[PDB]
Design an enzyme around this catalytic site. Structure first.
Site, PDB file in Angstrom:
ATOM      1  CG  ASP A  34      -1.953   1.160   1.308  1.00  0.00           C
ATOM      2  OD1 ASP A  34      -1.779   2.020   0.358  1.00  0.00           O
ATOM      3  OD2 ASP A  34      -2.549   1.179   2.567  1.00  0.00           O
ATOM      4  CG  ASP A  44     -10.956   8.428  -7.008  1.00  0.00           C
ATOM      5  OD1 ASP A  44     -11.772   8.382  -6.094  1.00  0.00           O
ATOM      6  OD2 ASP A  44     -10.758   9.268  -7.901  1.00  0.00           O
ATOM      7  CG  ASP A  84      -7.545  -1.782  -0.437  1.00  0.00           C
ATOM      8  OD1 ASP A  84      -6.772  -0.955  -1.129  1.00  0.00           O
ATOM      9  OD2 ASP A  84      -7.992  -1.816   0.584  1.00  0.00           O
TER      10      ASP A  84
END
Ligand SMILES: C[C@]12CC[C@H]3[C@@H](CCC4=CC(=O)CC[C@@H]43)[C@@H]1CC[C@@H]2O
Lengths: 127, 127
Positions: A40, A100, A103
């Site tokens: 991430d 935006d 996942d």
């Protein structure tokens, strides 16, 4: 529970977004397998295990006040995986902004997240 | 020509337009020789350009199939991206919609190395 069905994946990943929105890092960490990996944003070195995932996200959803909401339905497979589109609203240079994200998650045979990839970059940040 | 994040955005949106038009040979030209397609994710991967060609020919065999982005392309800095879109088709004599997220990895030549299409019947609806 066991390996989540497609309907169960939709519920789990929707719950995840609710936890991000309220900032419950503890509950997010418990959704992860103890040895999960998080990327991430995708392309950065993976984060490994609940301790590092907790530390990483207490930097974010503890430091500032952030919001999050699905921007479309959770897409779910029949092998315990899913993908979801959402938007995160936060402070940027003392100025609200929007990110935006998508996942992608793979759940294990105990219903916990084994791997998560968060697809986003600065092209997805808007002010 | 490992696509930048902005170039991934253009490549992935261009792919949705080729699907919408239905130019199957134009679609296949976007893939690398050794590409794999997992669609739906969870099923065994397809590999080989003609097998990929036959797969698109069966899905878009005309066959009034439409497709459109329902959100921005999320793009990384390692030549990968993810996008939410909506497929419109007819099934069981019923006009239907199917919500999908594709995840793609591009190679240093700008060609699709891996495609993963996340969806199942939970993402089907009648319109
Ligand atoms: C085959 C199909 C039309 C093409 C879709 C497919 C769903 C996955 C998808 C994703 C792509 O990237 C290409 C288009 C196909 C549909 C499932 C049922 C429908 O007929």
């Amino acid at each position: 529970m066991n390996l989540p069905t497609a309907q169960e994946v939709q519920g789990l990943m929707a719950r995840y977004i609710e936890l991000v929105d309220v900032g419950d890092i503890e509950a997010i960490v418990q959704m992860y397998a103890d040895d999960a990996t998080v990327e991430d944003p995708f392309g950065q070195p993976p984060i490994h295990g609940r301790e590092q995932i907790a530390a990483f996200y207490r930097q974010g959803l503890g430091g500032g006040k952030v919001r999050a909401c699905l921007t479309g339905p959770v897409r779910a497979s029949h092998n315990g995986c899913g993908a979801m589109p959402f938007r995160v609203e936060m402070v940027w240079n003392g100025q609200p902004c929007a990110l935006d994200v998508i996942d992608v998650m793979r759940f294990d045979e105990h219903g916990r997240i084994q791997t998560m990839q968060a697809y986003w970059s600065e092209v997805n940040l808007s002010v």
